[PDB]
């Protein structure tokens with residue numbers, strides 16, 4: 001009996017409403033009405049799905065000149081990012097920022113291993129000298145779990161290669177005091193530095209040998225291939241690499257004190273790609289001077305300044321020449337800002353100048369990542385949620401599984417919202433197509 | 447659309463939706479009812495159920 | 498097309514207000530009265546001096 | 555002294571050289587504030 | 598004196614259960630099956 005509208009007019013009828021359902025980003029982030037928000041205070045509303053999640057592209061600008069295939073950045077914490085974390089973050093499409101709670105020499109070495117790392121090779125081989133006993137070798141086999149040790153004249157990883165000693169050589173040996181030199185293979189098949197993974201593998205098939213030490217023109221060991229390792233066949237088609245040298249990208253943090261000017265020189269000399277100026281209140285004369293000295297002194301270095309939480313801070317450090325900004329303060333404290341409000345107001349100002357911003361702090365799951373980007377962040381930094389992983393200095397497993405899980409999770413969230421890439425996500429938020437809803441305390445518990 | 451053409455005596459409830467635009471889309475497609483709710487069963491995408 | 502970084506400071510004048518709330522806007526009984534210290538934060542400004550120079554008279 | 559030094563640093567972060575200056579800048583609108591939602595406090 | 602007569606994947610499973618030095622009933626050991634693709 002009662003009269004309803006014809007279903008065929010349903011789409012036409014959406015035009016009778018003054019606004020799309022939900023709030024635009026500007027309406028959500030109103031300081032007067034709704035105050036400082038964090039990620040947990042709101043949601044992104046779903047849109048229309050007309051594509052699979054596998055098609056979503058997550059390219060993200062880290063700096064004006066550096067672009068990553070994933071918006072993930074590991075934090076410069078001594079519990080999070082050292083050389084091992086930076087290598088795998090780069091391999092999986094992001095980047096690591098090595099901490100500076102160490103000597104300048106130690107930091108430069110860690111940067112060096114990242115820049116020199118070659119996938120598929122044992123880049124830091126365990127070695128033994130010739131004057132050691134079989135008993136010494138066997139002890140190493142139990143502690144490390146592998147026995148394939150090349151022997152160098154000085155017993156150091158970079159010494160001149162004399163031979164190779166493996167488990168097969170020492171399994172049945174009597175008289176444990178005998179030296180490695182007596183038992184070892186003197187004539188070692190090797191490969192020249194610069195051989196590629198395919199070329200090295202074929203040599204192992206031809207020679208049916210377990211290991212292939214790699215030596216330089218002076219005969220010093222550089223790396224080694226394990227036949228077992230290639231059999232896993234791990235590939236990294238999203239690896240983050242420098243444009244010029246095609247080496248893995250590497251980042252590093254420093255302070256603004258005078259001693260850190262020499263610290264950074266050592267990092268640049270190790271091949272550092274991007275430096276993060278590490279400070280809780282970055283809008284200072286000390287950091288501004290530091291930015292200007294870097295841009296004139298190291299012409300090929302990208303600089304991320306911070307931390308900032310306000311538009312005024314952002315404008316100051318952009319004027320000084322920053323290549324990116326790091327957003328966050330305290331996400332009890334007197335000075336700071338709720339992270340969501342911070343990201344929105346900085347990035348709304350900074351994105352007009354093309355300065356990408358890292359959202360640093362308060363990220364614990366895929367939901368925080370999506371919301372951080374939704375409010376204007378180009379990349380997101382991760383600390384606690386990466387601590388405890390295998391590649392960190394709890395028991396969360398390897399980031400080789402975790403980062404793809406987060407990568408896949410961010411693809412699905414983009415699909416639900418209805419955007420095919422982070423570039424499109426940014427445009428749709430800023431045009432008002434993507435909609436948001438503020439959450440009451442009860443809703444969060446729901 | 448395939449259901450409404452293939453099974454003439456079958457009623458279809460589509461979902462889940464939480465927004466007007468979602469609802470308008472699935473009604474235009476021919477839904478006989480809608481199922482409302484997203485994230486009430488932390489997550490990035492959803493809406494408080496009452497709203 | 499992005500804005501020139503050299504204009505960043507000049508561009509702050511295009512906004513009607515500074516980022517954040519003034520104290521008068523924060524302490525509005527009608528909008529959100531009844532605040533304690535834990536209900537707000539002070540936003541940071543610009544550092545151009547060491548902390549040892551601050552006078553607490 | 556710990557509290558004395560702590561108040562100096564917080565004044566530095568805000569950008570004021572003295573408590574007299576702190577008062578003047580607040581009352582002129584130069585010092586800015588942000589209201590915290592309950593979720594922000596737990597953060 | 599365990600032994601196994603005439604595939605390579607079945608020999609990798611028998612090593613886990615037990616030792617891969619099993620004569621064909623004439624010998625196959627771990628070294629032979631370590632890096633076999635098929």
Ligand SMILES: Nc1ncnc2c1ncn2[C@@H]1O[C@H](COP(=O)(O)OP(=O)(O)OP(=O)(O)O)[C@@H](O)[C@H]1O
Nearest residue numbers: 122124125126146147148149167210226227228229
């Ligand atoms: N010299 C080395 N330095 C570091 N890692 C090594 C070294 N030799 C082997 N490995 C690692 O040990 C693991 C096994 O490789 P491999 O199986 O080739 O060692 P093995 O010495 O061959 O052990 P087995 O006694 O089982 O023959 C791989 O992950 C490989 O990277």
Ligand SMILES: Nc1ncnc2c1ncn2[C@@H]1O[C@H](COP(=O)(O)OP(=O)(O)OP(=O)(O)O)[C@@H](O)[C@H]1O
Nearest residue numbers: 164165166167168185188189209210211212213628
């Ligand atoms: N790259 C190499 N060039 C020349 N000889 C090698 C090389 N690598 C290992 N050898 C020697 O050749 C023999 C086999 O090397 P392998 O490393 O294959 O033994 P294992 O790997 O120790 O035992 P398994 O092969 O059972 O894991 C050993 O005597 C070893 O010393």
Ligand SMILES: Nc1ncnc2c1ncn2[C@@H]1O[C@H](COP(=O)(O)OP(=O)(O)OP(=O)(O)O)[C@@H](O)[C@H]1O
Nearest residue numbers: 255256257258278279280281284286544546547548
């Ligand atoms: N190059 C410099 N020359 C002089 N003083 C400096 C320099 N760099 C930093 N400072 C001062 O040293 C103190 C710490 O600077 P930092 O960059 O460490 O800020 P923070 O990280 O906020 O310190 P905390 O972590 O204790 O808060 C600040 O008071 C800052 O003004």
Ligand SMILES: Nc1ncnc2c1ncn2[C@@H]1O[C@H](COP(=O)(O)OP(=O)(O)OP(=O)(O)O)[C@@H](O)[C@H]1O
Nearest residue numbers: 171598599600612615616617618619620626627628
């Ligand atoms: N065919 C077998 N039948 C019974 N026990 C065996 C057999 N092969 C190996 N073992 C057990 O392993 C011990 C040593 O054998 P060995 O270790 O010499 O062969 P492997 O175990 O095959 O060596 P790898 O496992 O290192 O290739 C024997 O003393 C016995 O306990």
Ligand SMILES: [Mg+2]
Nearest residue numbers: 148166210228
């Ligand atoms: Mg081996």
